[PDB]
Amino acid sequence: SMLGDVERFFSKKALEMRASEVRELLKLVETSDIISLAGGLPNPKTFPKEIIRDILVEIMEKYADKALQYGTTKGFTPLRETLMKWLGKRYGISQDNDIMITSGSQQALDLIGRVFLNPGDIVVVEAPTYLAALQAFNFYEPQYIQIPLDDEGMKVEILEEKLKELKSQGKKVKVVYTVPTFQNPAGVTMNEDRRKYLLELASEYDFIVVEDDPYGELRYSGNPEKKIKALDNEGRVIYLGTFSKILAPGFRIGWMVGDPGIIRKMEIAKQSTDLCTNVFGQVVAWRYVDGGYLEKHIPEIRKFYKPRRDAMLEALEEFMPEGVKWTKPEGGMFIWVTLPDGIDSKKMLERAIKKGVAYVPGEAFYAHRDVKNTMRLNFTYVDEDKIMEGIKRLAETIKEELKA
Amino acid sequence: SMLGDVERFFSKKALEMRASEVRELLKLVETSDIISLAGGLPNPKTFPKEIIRDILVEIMEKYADKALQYGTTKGFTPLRETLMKWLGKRYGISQDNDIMITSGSQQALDLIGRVFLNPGDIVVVEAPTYLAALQAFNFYEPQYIQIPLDDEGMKVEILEEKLKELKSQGKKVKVVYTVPTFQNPAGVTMNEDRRKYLLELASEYDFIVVEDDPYGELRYSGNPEKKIKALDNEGRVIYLGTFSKILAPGFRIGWMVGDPGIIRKMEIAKQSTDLCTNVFGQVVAWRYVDGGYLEKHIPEIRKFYKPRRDAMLEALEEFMPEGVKWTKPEGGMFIWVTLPDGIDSKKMLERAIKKGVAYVPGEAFYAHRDVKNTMRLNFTYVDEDKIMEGIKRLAETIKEELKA
Ligand SMILES: *Cc1c(COP(=O)(O)O)cnc(C)c1O
Numbered sequence: 042s043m044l045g046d047v048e049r050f051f052s053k054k055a056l057e058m059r060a061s062e063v064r065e066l067l068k069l070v071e072t073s074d075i076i077s078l079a080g081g082l083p084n085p086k087t088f089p090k091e092i093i094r095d096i097l098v099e100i101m102e103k104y105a106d107k108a109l110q111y112g113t114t115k116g117f118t119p120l121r122e123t124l125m126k127w128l129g130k131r132y133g134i135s136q137d138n139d140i141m142i143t144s145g146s147q148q149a150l151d152l153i154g155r156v157f158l159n160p161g162d163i164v165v166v167e168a169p170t171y172l173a174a175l176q177a178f179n180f181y182e183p184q185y186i187q188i189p190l191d192d193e194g195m196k197v198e199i200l201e202e203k204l205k206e207l208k209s210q211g212k213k214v215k216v217v218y219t220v221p222t223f224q225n226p227a228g229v230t231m232n233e234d235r236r237k238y239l240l241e242l243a244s245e246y247d248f249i250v251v252e253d254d255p256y257g258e259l260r261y262s263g264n265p266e267k268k269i270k271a272l273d274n275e276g277r278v279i280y281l282g283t284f285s286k287i288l289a290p291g292f293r294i295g296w297m298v299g300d301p302g303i304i305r306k307m308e309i310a311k312q313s314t315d316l317c318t319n320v321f322g323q324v325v326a327w328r329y330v331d332g333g334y335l336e337k338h339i340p341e342i343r344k345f346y347k348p349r350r351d352a353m354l355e356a357l358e359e360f361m362p363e364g365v366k367w368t369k370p371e372g373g374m375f376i377w378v379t380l381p382d383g384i385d386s387k388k389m390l391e392r393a394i395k396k397g398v399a400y401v402p403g404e405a406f407y408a409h410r411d412v413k414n415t416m417r418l419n420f421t422y423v424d425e426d427k428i429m430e431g432i433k434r435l436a437e438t439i440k441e442e443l444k445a
Numbered sequence: 446s447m448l449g450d451v452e453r454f455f456s457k458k459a460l461e462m463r464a465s466e467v468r469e470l471l472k473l474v475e476t477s478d479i480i481s482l483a484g485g486l487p488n489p490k491t492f493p494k495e496i497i498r499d500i501l502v503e504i505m506e507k508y509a510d511k512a513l514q515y516g517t518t519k520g521f522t523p524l525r526e527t528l529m530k531w532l533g534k535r536y537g538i539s540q541d542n543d544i545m546i547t548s549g550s551q552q553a554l555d556l557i558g559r560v561f562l563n564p565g566d567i568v569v570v571e572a573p574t575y576l577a578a579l580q581a582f583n584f585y586e587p588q589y590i591q592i593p594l595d596d597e598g599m600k601v602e603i604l605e606e607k608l609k610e611l612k613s614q615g616k617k618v619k620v621v622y623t624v625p626t627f628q629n630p631a632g633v634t635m636n637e638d639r640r641k642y643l644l645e646l647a648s649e650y651d652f653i654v655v656e657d658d659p660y661g662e663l664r665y666s667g668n669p670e671k672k673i674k675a676l677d678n679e680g681r682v683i684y685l686g687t688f689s690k691i692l693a694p695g696f697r698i699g700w701m702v703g704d705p706g707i708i709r710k711m712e713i714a715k716q717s718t719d720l721c722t723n724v725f726g727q728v729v730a731w732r733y734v735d736g737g738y739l740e741k742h743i744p745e746i747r748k749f750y751k752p753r754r755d756a757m758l759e760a761l762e763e764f765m766p767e768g769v770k771w772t773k774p775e776g777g778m779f780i781w782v783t784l785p786d787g788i789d790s791k792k793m794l795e796r797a798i799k800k801g802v803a804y805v806p807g808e809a810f811y812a813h814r815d816v817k818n819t820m821r822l823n824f825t826y827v828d829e830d831k832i833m834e835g836i837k838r839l840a841e842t843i844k845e846e847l848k849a
Pocket residue numbers: 144145146147148171220225253255282283284285286290294295719720
């Protein structure tokens with residue numbers, strides 16, 4: 042810096058901000074020939090480019106002034122209306138909720154932090170959870186309580202235990218943040234009974250639930266779950282959806298659905314952070330949903346990713362040594378691996394990279410960074426054939442790591 | 446709200462957020478046939494829709510995967526490169542600065558607040574200043590020092606006086622925020638001597654200057670000023686530009702240029718608020734600048750707005766009673782009017798609306814809401830002929846207000 046101790050200008054929060062060492066390494070790995078299973082991106086082969094092209098022409102012919110001008114903070118009305126119609130028909134989400142357009146669900150999470158969190162307020166997350174949600178919330182200084190998952194998602198029973206123990210300390214949780222379907226990073230889905238149990242606790246202990254659902258349409262097997270938001274009679278759930286994996290992430294459009302009191306506050310908070318979400322992408326998304334193209338395209342995304350999931354699950358079963366375990370997602374973009382004998386997968390990544398494969402070490406996904414034997418693998422954006430070869434390389438890395 | 450008192454969940458900052466009731470009234474005024482001089486929007490007749498259409502075609506042919514995928518937090522590299530080439534050639538901004546793409550300069554202002562401001566840190570603003578900048582910064586709880594403007598922009602003399610008084614109290618300012626060319630709302634421009642004088646203060650008193658410049662290309666008369674950032678030898682200036690009025694606001698793309706140490710921190714802060722600025726709009730903006738289209742389009746914007754500024758200035762001279770004063774902008778979107786005899790323009794707005802004209806009361810533009818006899822008029826987006834009629838109605842409103 043020219044200033045040169047530029048830190049003398051920084052806020053207390055800025056002084057605690059740091060770039061991820063791991064994320065920097067992984068940026069590098071992506072530009073090389075290593076087989077990376079570390080990505081979190083959807084595959085551009087799933088972007089509906091011809092429908093997008095037709096929609097762009099349509100906008101310049103018919104909607105140019107609306108797409109080009111500033112928008113309201115709350116969002117482009119036709120997109121808000123078409124999304125609530127979609128959500129009600131498809132999922133049985135109630136129309137008495139309100140809806141705000143966001144600049145991605147990342148912006149929803151930042152705004153949830155601004156609107157709800159005072160320093161020291163308690164947020165419950167799953168262990169593991171979505172690392173960007175921890176990043177969003179961390180700016181607001183919450184305390185976290187972590188609730189492990191199993192193959193049926195959040196162990197809501199341990200959440201009841203922890204809520205009782207907090208209550209005995211005179212304390213309460215303010216927000217439970219859940220990614221309950223095809224989790225990033227775990228790949229598992231909260232079952233129906235647990236969704237209902239979470240909501241009874243939400244009532245009994247008076248907290249807000251944030252349900253982040255980027256992947257529910259990327260279902261490859263099994264039957265659709267009920268959204269927590271569709272079971273929400275009290276209006277305690279804030280539901281987040283996004284176009285990132287069902288259209289493309291390049292337009293940075295998502296939506297937040299919830300109690301109108303909560304939405305109204307979110308709108309005022311948003312106004313000062315970005316004025317409005319880009320209206321041009323909102324008009325594109327509106328034509329995409331309202332024109333029926335989202336509905337028609339969803340099966341093409343599923344057809345593309347399913348065999349990639351299945352190839353990875355096949356390779357793990359054939360190559361992984363005993364004592365390695367992994368989740369079996371019915372949808373989404375990730376499979377989550379648990380390593381035996383105390384291997385530290387952060388320490389192992391150096392060995393894996395040397396053997397030609399990368400993954401994201403699981404530690405980063407725990408609020409308390411306190412579990413070390415887990416890894417996130419992605420199947421959406423490796424070259425297919427490279428899924429088999431990448432899983433072999435990782436299996437051999439684990440074999441050698443296991444040798445003292 | 447379904448939750449009963451939903452306020453029980455809100456953070457301390459959320460509890461202080463309120464919708465502007467002036468802004469609510471003016472929303473309604475816009476949908477009626479009152480002549481509104483209250484807008485802050487550029488005119489869609491200036492949007493380069495043909496060029497945009499060609500650019501969209503080009504992107505789907507050649508750049509679709511980049512435009513549709515997630516981007517890096519820092520921004521789309523070709524856009525960052527083309528902007529720095531543009532800013533160096535056009536303005537002499539130095540290439541040792543770094544650049545980050547933002548989701549509008551509104552997002553730049555929020556991020557400046559996040560990165561620099563602890564509660565109680567002192568921010569200097571002009572009096573008046575841009576209301577949304579006050580909104581962005583208010584979340585971070587600064588103390589403001591207001592420095593009045595004259596027809597040559599900020600009275601930097603008074604800033605030196607206030608910096609010496611604060612120093613005597615053992616205090617310092619952290620940031621001076623300036624809109625030094627065709628100010629929103631005042632329409633005036635800081636002269637060259639004062640730009641140099643501000644930077645001497647910034648060195649002597651050790652503060653950062655944020656230069657927000659959305660309008661410098663919308664110059665209708667006179668000669669181009671030197672950007673503060675072009676005089677900035679010490680790397681103390683963070684320069685904000687935006688495509689809102691030179692392309693169209695619908696893509697919500699801006700940029701922030703400054704010391705690489707400050708930009709690096711800004712990138713980490715932004716990552717948690719929105720992951721990245723919409724890449725699709727950044728590819729559009731890149732073709733727009735790199736293809737020469739921006740440079741070709743700017744004279745078309747100037748040709749459009751100039752006669753509207755001139756009609757409004759003619760109408761004010763012909764119609765306004767003695768003792769009314771207004772600024773004489775060489776550019777931008779606004780004229781700023783000062784009323785005599787202690788008229789309160791917020792109180793007068795009810796009378797103006799009854800007579801068929803609206804404007805924005807000046808009070809909202811003062812950090813300390815302490816001046817009551819000013820108004821912001823916009824000439825960019827009234828249907829022109831209505832500029833003369835609007836100014837006449839406002840002149841008659843002021844004459845009636847001056848009576849008992
Ligand atoms: C993919 C992902 C998102 C997407 O966020 P956007 O900002 O909308 O792109 C949000 N939450 C989780 C858990 C994700 O995995």
